[PDB]
Amino acid sequence: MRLPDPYTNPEYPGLGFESVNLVDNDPISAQYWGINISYPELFPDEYAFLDSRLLEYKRTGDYLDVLLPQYEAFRVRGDTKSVTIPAGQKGSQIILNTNGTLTGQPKAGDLFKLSTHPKVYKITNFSSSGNVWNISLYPDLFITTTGSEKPVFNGILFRTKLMNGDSFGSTLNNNGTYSGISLSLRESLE
Numbered sequence: 261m262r263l264p265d266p267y268t269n270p271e272y273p274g275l276g277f278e279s280v281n282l283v284d285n286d287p288i289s290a291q292y293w294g295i296n297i298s299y300p301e302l303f304p305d306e307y308a309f310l311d312s313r314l315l316e317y318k319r320t321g322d323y324l325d326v327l328l329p330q331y332e333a334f335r336v337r338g339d340t341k342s343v344t345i346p347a348g349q350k351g352s353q354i355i356l357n358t359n360g361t362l363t364g365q366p367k368a369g370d371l372f373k374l375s376t377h378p379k380v381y382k383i384t385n386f387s388s389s390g391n392v393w394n395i396s397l398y399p400d401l402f403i404t405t406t407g408s409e410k411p412v413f414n415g416i417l418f419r420t421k422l423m424n425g426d427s428f429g430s431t432l433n434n435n436g437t438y439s440g441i442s443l444s445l446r447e448s449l450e
Contacts, residue, residue: 261313261320261323262326263324263443264310264313265277265327265329267327267329272303272306272309273306274300274301274302274306274307275309277297277328277329278298278299279297279298280295280328280330281295282294283295286399289449290399290402290449291398292446293418293446294423294444294445295443295444295446295447296444296445297326297444297445299441299442299443301433301435301437301439302430302437303437303438304432307437307438311429314422314428317422323420323421323448324421324422324445325418325419325420326417327415327416328416328418331370331371332415333413335366337362337363337364337414338361338363340361340375340411340412341410343356343358343410343411344356344359344407345357345374345405345407345408345409345411346405348404348405348407349401349404350404350405351400352396352399352400352401353394353396353397354394354395354397354411355392356392356411357392357393358391358393359391362393365393366383366413369383370383370413371383371413372395372413373411373412374401374405374409374410374411374412375409375410375411377402377403378419379402379449380416380418380447381397381398381399381401382398383395383397384396402449418447419447420446420447421445421446421448423444423446424442424443
């Protein structure tokens with residue numbers, strides 16, 4: 261379940277977020293991101309759409325994949341598939357070999373994800389030596405690299421669970437829209 265937005269569904273611009281907060285949970289357990297999405301007033305058809313998607317989400321027990329457009333930095337561009345990430349890596353640093361196919365560089369604060377695993381990281385520092393990139397991450401890597409991972413800097417989806425199904429919804433207001441819709445999502449560690 262991709263959480264529908266104006267990219268997937270440009271016919272519903274209200275599905276653009278009014279506000280989003282990315283929240284750090286550092287438990288006893290592993291770190292996980294919390295996401296709080298607030299919508300502007302939704303019109304009947306876009307509200308009806310989102311409603312039905314969340315319902316389908318409810319009955320199938322799936323995850324919800326979410327894009328946060330605020331993090332569409334596009335500070336790094338190029339052929340990520342020709343990047344090499346050496347095997348055996350763990351901890352808070354991730355080294356990769358760009359093979360000269362990347363342009364630009366990421367900065368502290370940007371998101372990062374491995375192609376083969378759903379966990380999303382924050383980039384905390386970055387240095388390079390020619391085509392060698394040294395990306396410092398938070399939290400530590402959830403897996404040891406296999407050698408087949410590719411870096412993801414843009415179009416990162418968080419794999420989440422809805423926390424507030426029981427307070428989701430609104431009723432028609434006096435200008436024929438639905439106010440106060442917000443979603444509270446928790447990154448799911450499988």
